[PDB]
Design an enzyme around this catalytic site. Structure first.
Site, PDB file in Angstrom:
ATOM      1  N   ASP A 166       0.818  -0.936  -0.090  1.00  0.00           N
ATOM      2  CA  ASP A 166      -0.220  -0.125   0.222  1.00  0.00           C
ATOM      3  C   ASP A 166       0.544   0.863  -0.108  1.00  0.00           C
ATOM      4  O   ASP A 166       0.758   2.040   1.328  1.00  0.00           O
ATOM      5  CB  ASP A 166      -1.099   0.044   1.274  1.00  0.00           C
ATOM      6  CG  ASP A 166      -1.687   0.987   0.890  1.00  0.00           C
ATOM      7  OD1 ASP A 166      -2.723   1.518   0.008  1.00  0.00           O
ATOM      8  OD2 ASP A 166      -2.302   1.505   2.551  1.00  0.00           O
ATOM      9  N   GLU A 396       3.583  -7.723   7.526  1.00  0.00           N
ATOM     10  CA  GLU A 396       2.447  -9.248   7.349  1.00  0.00           C
ATOM     11  C   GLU A 396       2.773  -9.890   6.207  1.00  0.00           C
ATOM     12  O   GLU A 396       2.160  -9.746   5.433  1.00  0.00           O
ATOM     13  CB  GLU A 396       1.215  -7.960   6.727  1.00  0.00           C
ATOM     14  CG  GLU A 396       0.824  -7.002   8.037  1.00  0.00           C
ATOM     15  CD  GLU A 396      -0.110  -6.087   7.598  1.00  0.00           C
ATOM     16  OE1 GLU A 396      -0.777  -5.917   5.746  1.00  0.00           O
ATOM     17  OE2 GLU A 396      -0.736  -5.119   8.654  1.00  0.00           O
ATOM     18  N   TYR A 449      -6.261  -3.256  13.127  1.00  0.00           N
ATOM     19  CA  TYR A 449      -7.373  -1.717  12.255  1.00  0.00           C
ATOM     20  C   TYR A 449      -8.913  -3.076  12.599  1.00  0.00           C
ATOM     21  O   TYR A 449     -10.310  -2.706  11.890  1.00  0.00           O
ATOM     22  CB  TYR A 449      -8.258  -2.236  10.683  1.00  0.00           C
ATOM     23  CG  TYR A 449      -6.037  -1.032  10.499  1.00  0.00           C
ATOM     24  CD1 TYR A 449      -6.172  -0.260   9.747  1.00  0.00           C
ATOM     25  CD2 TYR A 449      -5.218  -2.471  10.136  1.00  0.00           C
ATOM     26  CE1 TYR A 449      -4.511   0.814   9.604  1.00  0.00           C
ATOM     27  CE2 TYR A 449      -3.857  -1.761   9.506  1.00  0.00           C
ATOM     28  CZ  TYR A 449      -3.636  -0.386   9.964  1.00  0.00           C
ATOM     29  OH  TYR A 449      -2.468   0.406   9.463  1.00  0.00           O
ATOM     30  N   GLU A 487       0.959  -0.771  14.175  1.00  0.00           N
ATOM     31  CA  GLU A 487      -0.385   0.222  13.509  1.00  0.00           C
ATOM     32  C   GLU A 487      -1.267  -0.272  13.659  1.00  0.00           C
ATOM     33  O   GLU A 487      -1.670  -0.918  13.833  1.00  0.00           O
ATOM     34  CB  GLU A 487      -0.204  -0.487  11.322  1.00  0.00           C
ATOM     35  CG  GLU A 487       1.146  -0.229  11.152  1.00  0.00           C
ATOM     36  CD  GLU A 487       1.442  -0.524   9.847  1.00  0.00           C
ATOM     37  OE1 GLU A 487       0.021  -0.798   9.151  1.00  0.00           O
ATOM     38  OE2 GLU A 487       1.572  -1.050   8.894  1.00  0.00           O
TER      39      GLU A 487
HETATM   40  O1  LIG Z   1      -4.466  -0.486   4.897  1.00  0.00           O
HETATM   41  C1  LIG Z   1      -3.443  -0.102   5.702  1.00  0.00           C
HETATM   42  O2  LIG Z   1      -3.734   1.262   5.699  1.00  0.00           O
HETATM   43  C2  LIG Z   1      -2.217  -0.232   6.025  1.00  0.00           C
HETATM   44  O3  LIG Z   1      -2.618  -1.794   6.074  1.00  0.00           O
HETATM   45  C3  LIG Z   1      -1.034  -2.625   6.734  1.00  0.00           C
HETATM   46  O4  LIG Z   1      -1.386  -3.845   6.492  1.00  0.00           O
HETATM   47  C4  LIG Z   1       0.074  -2.325   5.686  1.00  0.00           C
HETATM   48  O5  LIG Z   1       0.714  -2.265   7.093  1.00  0.00           O
HETATM   49  C5  LIG Z   1       0.168  -1.013   5.835  1.00  0.00           C
HETATM   50  O6  LIG Z   1       1.105  -0.204   4.911  1.00  0.00           O
HETATM   51  C6  LIG Z   1      -0.870   0.068   4.612  1.00  0.00           C
HETATM   52  O7  LIG Z   1      -1.386   1.375   4.618  1.00  0.00           O
END
Ligand SMILES: O=C(O)[C@H]1O[C@@H](O)[C@H](O)[C@@H](O)[C@@H]1O
Ligand SMILES: O=C(O)[C@H]1O[C@@H](O)[C@H](O)[C@@H](O)[C@@H]1O
Lengths: 572, 576
Positions: A166, A396, A449, A487
């Site tokens: 991404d 990942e 997320y 993240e």
């Molecule tokens: O979807 C996203 O924002 C993110 O998803 C995560 O899995 C990735 O590590 C990251 O690099 C992406 O930008």
């Protein structure tokens, strides 16, 4: 390595000359450059800034999206006094792969777009004359080199990069380029490792040179005063009442490495280093024997127009923003950054998790070779920065298979052998790696997320419950290792306000972060939180990316969204 | 000048080393640095990128808005081989004024923030050793230097810049810095002027050196082939079948100037030049004897975070945008730009109106005139040999309706004429207060430049039909004066917020920007003597905060990031 990763310096023994500026540049869609003699000079070039990514200068799609072979050229005068030196071209990087020519002769090739390329032009250089450098570069993505992706061929032969990651496929000469001159016998590498002994410290070292003459190592304090000195390519410097390098409170010594013969010094290398220890103890990350909780961001090398092009101005603004949030850490998501980022982290007392471009992963043996080479180069380049406290060896990948374990066992073994300090190693796991690879890790990094990709928006209370469910499972495993969230974030469009909040609004970003914090704070073994992302950044265009990735806490122009103050207040 | 303006090069006789990078930096609010030994090193510095403006890095108001004294420092290693050369520090600029120290010694001072500062460190340089440079800089505004403004003191001693001009008071070391080594006898200056002779051309030249040894001058074509050679510090190079530098179709020769010592060479200077002529003939601007109509923009040196800091990436993006609009010209509003802008215009065949920072001028006047003349001399000496530079702008919107004003500008124009070997067109931008039958200065101008905002500051929005009538009324007055000179509109535009759409349009919308431009074009095209249109501005740019500026000036046709608003296409289609 058949070259030195050491950052170039200038003194009596070592010279450097910047090749940054406007280079000549030519696209090669038909792949005819070499059979047309382009290594002797490009036939119809345009101008291209170096350092910069080439993509965002142009006003037409085909040049922005160019994928395939393309060429750089410049000319430089070499001082006559550089004769009888070892003369090298040094590229901060060449993205993604390239072959370096000088005065029409092939010098070296390199695969991997985010670490230095060294080309020994000693035998073809012409001191006291104008010299030529030409670089053939390729920016395609494949499954045997990092970062992974594919190349699509449109019916007319035009190539299009298809990332498995991404972020936009920026490429070119994105970092500074030098021509340098070294003594015939030089310091090629060194390593330091620290031990704390009461109020004193030991600096254990090894030095690698290109000859057999004696080595002297000196350590100077921040005022340039001698605090330790010893002889030999391996040794220990004893530092009385050492001033330790501390989080957000740096102190830097200067190591001085001399090669001597009977008539004096042959080479001198010097670099700032910081005395500090990093260790994992149970669920704690210990810096100088005291627990530290990581607070910060994943970043990118990304800025308007320049792309990933290096500029000290971006470093300065970003660090001022980091300090304003009360951060102490960032990860070099998802590739090693320009060396200057680490130099500055050293000065400002920031902690870095240094990450190899192992993203988009699944030819496997070839991929492993590339992965290990990038790891070796990253660690050899970055090991002596006090800021670098951990290596991230993946982001990942697949991890729920027997073979995957064998693969990463070799990567981690390689990292261990190249890191003199044997500092903590990790990687970022996606949720698919449901609660045999995490045991290779000294601490566990999770990308999550909950509240964005999983149960977002009206389902956010369900997201919190699901998040707690997963963390309860981790808790029940009783792994006794630290967990760091590497993240978490929500796409957020600056100026999109809604009451009540919606996904993509500034208010939702705040609420999402508050929910995540509640979960983080419910588990003792959580020892860090790095938000995704520090700033909005460019991606491949598509139906899910509204001018790139908007999970930034700052805009791409480096201004704070509402959520920025949430971090500031919490991390205070 | 007591120094050379020539761009630094590297060869067997001349050396150069970049000092760009992270410098040390410290604010000096109490003005105690020179009282406290700071010229030997700053006591508690932070890091500062060079080149860059310092303001937009910080996260606090007081550092961003800092006005007063502030200091830079760096260290560099000088190769032993530079010993006994003439060794100079060369700053692309020091904004606004400053004093250069080297190894603790005061070297030179300079007033004026947009042109090179040369400091001769020959007697204090330490070859084969680490050297130190420290610069004391000040960014206050006053009425005796350019650009003009005032300094306000807040209650607590804190200074605030108060510009008399519409751009943010960016300052610091905004351009590249070098240390260079020159031979003891060197080429200090040269000038070229062109004459077209059918298919051939003459390059008339003068060379100034710091000695008395013989000079040889060679001209090489774009392939490096010798096409002409002559001897002497003054002479003429005859070029058979000359390839002329043409608008948006550049060709560059290389001039090579040698100082010789019988059986050898003492110095060599090389620079790319373009063979071209520019004249005013009646109401026409002639380039190589053919009329050209100017199409383009006023710009700024302005970009997110970097401020006015120079970067080749900004040059590249901006020129790609310019070409996409089918432009052929820009004005360096409102100060000379980094030298690289002109180098690139030379390569891309763009025409430049080169402007001295004479904005905001509306017993201190004698000092102001001296400053104005000095900046003019430096600008012209620096930029004269660029083929792209086809005119000098010597003011932007001063008072012009009194007799004192006429005497002031007579001296400025006379100085400019003395320094320009080519005697190319000189002009300045007039604001509306300089009414046709009130103005006293336009006769000094080779062609007339007008900044006009009929439809924005005058009768905007619902009154735009009245704005157009008022505009035609003024142009009718100019027409009736029968001045027989070209007119160029150097500014016209509307603040426009990207994404603000309205039907019907409103002031500040993208649609109103389009309609305003269309109205202006109708007026322009109604007068034969109009010979150019430069829109204000190429891109949104930073200004002082206030109730009239929504994060700077939004009259850009492009956003600050360099992306097109709706009106960009309007220009593209018209200029095609
Ligand atoms: O979807 C996203 O924002 C993110 O998803 C995560 O899995 C990735 O590590 C990251 O690099 C992406 O930008
Ligand atoms: O008000 C404006 O937008 C402009 O007005 C003109 O008078 C100035 O020459 C220009 O620098 C300003 O930006």
């Amino acid at each position: 390595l058949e070259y030195s990763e050491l950052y170039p310096i200038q003194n009596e023994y070592r010279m450097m000359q910047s090749l940054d500026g406007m280079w000549k540049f030519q696209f090669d869609p038909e792949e005819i450059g070499k059979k047309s003699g382009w290594e002797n000079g490009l036939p119809a070039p345009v101008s291209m800034p170096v350092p910069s990514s080439f993509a965002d200068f142009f006003t037409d799609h085909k040049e922005r999206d160019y994928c395939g072979d393309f060429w750089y050229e410049t000319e430089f005068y070499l001082p006559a006094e550089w004769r009888n030196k070892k003369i090298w071209l040094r590229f901060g990087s060449i993205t993604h792969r390239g072959t370096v020519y000088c005065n029409g002769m092939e010098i070296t090739s390199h695969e991997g777009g985010f670490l230095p390329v060294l080309a020994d032009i000693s035998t073809v250089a012409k001191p006291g004359q104008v010299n030529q450098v030409v670089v053939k570069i390729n920016n395609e993505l494949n499954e045997t080199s990092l970062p992974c992706g594919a190349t699509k061929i449109l019916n007319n032969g035009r190539k299009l990069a298809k990332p498995y990651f991404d972020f936009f496929n920026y490429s070119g000469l994105q970092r500074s380029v030098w021509v340098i001159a070294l003594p015939e016998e030089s310091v090629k590498d060194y390593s330091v490792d620290y031990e704390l002994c009461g109020t004193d410290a030991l600096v254990k070292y090894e030095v690698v040179t290109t000859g057999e003459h004696p080595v002297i190592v000196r350590l100077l304090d921040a005022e340039g005063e001698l605090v330790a000195e010893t002889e030999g390519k391996e040794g220990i410097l004893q530092v009385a009442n050492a001033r330790l390098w501390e989080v957000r409170n740096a102190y830097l010594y200067q190591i001085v490495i001399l090669i001597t013969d009977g008539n004096g010094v042959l080479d001198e290398y010097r670099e700032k280093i910081g005395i500090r220890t990093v260790r994992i103890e149970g669920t704690k990350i210990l810096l100088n024997d005291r627990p530290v909780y990581l607070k910060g961001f994943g970043k990118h090398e990304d800025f308007p127009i320049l792309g990933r092009g290096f500029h000290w101005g971006i470093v300065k603004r970003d660090f001022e923003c980091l300090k304003w949030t009360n951060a102490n850490c960032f990860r070099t998501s998802h590739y090693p950054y320009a060396e200057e980022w680490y130099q500055f982290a050293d000065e400002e007392g920031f902690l870095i998790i240094d990450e190899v471009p192992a993203v988009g992963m699944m030819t496997v043996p070839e991929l492993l070779k590339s992965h290990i080479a990038d790891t070796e180069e990253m660690i050899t380049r970055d090991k002596n920065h006090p800021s670098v406290i951990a290596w991230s060896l993946f982001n990942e990948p697949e991890t729920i298979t027997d073979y995957a374990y064998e693969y990463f066992k070799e990567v981690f073994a390689a990292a261990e052998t190249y890191d003199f300090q044997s500092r903590p190693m990790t990687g970022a796991f996606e949720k698919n790696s449901k609660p045999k690879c995490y045991p290779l890790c000294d601490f566990i990094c999770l990308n999550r997320y909950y509240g964005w990709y999983i149960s977002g928006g009206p389902e956010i209370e369900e997201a919190e419950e699901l998040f707690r469910d997963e963390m309860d499972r981790w808790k029940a495993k009783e792994l006794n290792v630290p967990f760091v969230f590497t993240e978490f974030g929500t796409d957020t469009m600056a100026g999109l306000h809604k009451l009540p909040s919606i996904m993509w609004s500034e208010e939702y970003q705040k609420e999402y972060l508050e929910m995540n914090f509640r979960v983080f704070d419910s588990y003792e073994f959580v020892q860090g939180e790095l938000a995704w992302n520090f700033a909005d950044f460019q991606t491949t265009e598509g139906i899910m990316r509204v001018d790139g990735n908007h999970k930034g806490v700052f805009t791409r122009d480096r201004q704070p969204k509402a959520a920025a103050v949430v971090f500031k207040d919490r991390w205070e």
